[PDB]
Design a protein around this ligand. Structure first.
Ligand SMILES: CCCCCCCCCCCCCCCC(=O)O
Ligand SMILES: CCCCCCCCCCCCCCCC(=O)O
Length: 129
C-alpha cells in the first residue's frame, strides 16, 4: 500500500497552457487554475483506486498495474491504457500522447504530465489519514 493516502496540491506549473491544449473548456480552467485539489489513493497490491477532487469536479478512477484499464481524464474523455510501476513509488502511463509520471517521496507526491514541450507539474502533500 505504498501510495495509499490523502494528498492536497501545494503548487503546480503550466496548468492553463496544458489544460487549454487538451481541450478543457476555458470556464473550467479559469475556475480551476488556483484550486488546491485533493487526491485520495487506495493501493492494495497491484490494485489502485483514486479520486481527484477539484472544486465541483470529482474524478474517480481505478486500474490494475500492468493490465489494460480505462481512465477518465481531465475533459471527461475515457482512454484505454496501461499503468506500470517503476519501483514501489512511481506510476507511469501514457494516453493521448501525454506521458504521466506520478512519484511518491515520503509524504510528497509529484505528478509530471508531458505533452510535447509542455510539462505540467503538480506537487501535493499528504493531509492526515
Ligand atoms: C466549479 C468547480 C469546477 C472546477 C474545474 C476543475 C478543472 C480541473 C480539472 C483537472 C483536474 C485533474 C488534474 C490532475 C490529474 C493528475 O495530475 O493526476
Ligand atoms: C485525470 C486522471 C489522469 C490519470 C493520471 C495517471 C493515472 C495513474 C496515477 C494515478 C495516481 C493519482 C495521483 C494524483 C497526483 C495529483 O493529484 O497530482
Amino acid at each position: 500500500s505504498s501510495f495509499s493516502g490523502k494528498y492536497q496540491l501545494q503548487s503546480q506549473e503550466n496548468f492553463e497552457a496544458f489544460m487549454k491544449a487538451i481541450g478543457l473548456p476555458e470556464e473550467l480552467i479559469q475556475k480551476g487554475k488556483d484550486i488546491k485539489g485533493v487526491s485520495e489513493i487506495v493501493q492494495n497490491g497491484k490494485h489502485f483506486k483514486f479520486t481527484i477532487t477539484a472544486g465541483s469536479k470529482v474524478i474517480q478512477n481505478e486500474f490494475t498495474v500492468g493490465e489494460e484499464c480505462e481512465l477518465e481524464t481531465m475533459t471527461g474523455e475515457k482512454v484505454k491504457t496501461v499503468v506500470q510501476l517503476e519501483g514501489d513509488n512511481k506510476l507511469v502511463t501514457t494516453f493521448k500522447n501525454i506521458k504521466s509520471v506520478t512519484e511518491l517521496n515520503g509524504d510528497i507526491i509529484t505528478n509530471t504530465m508531458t505533452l510535447g514541450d509542455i510539462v505540467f507539474k503538480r506537487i501535493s502533500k499528504r493531509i492526515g489519514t
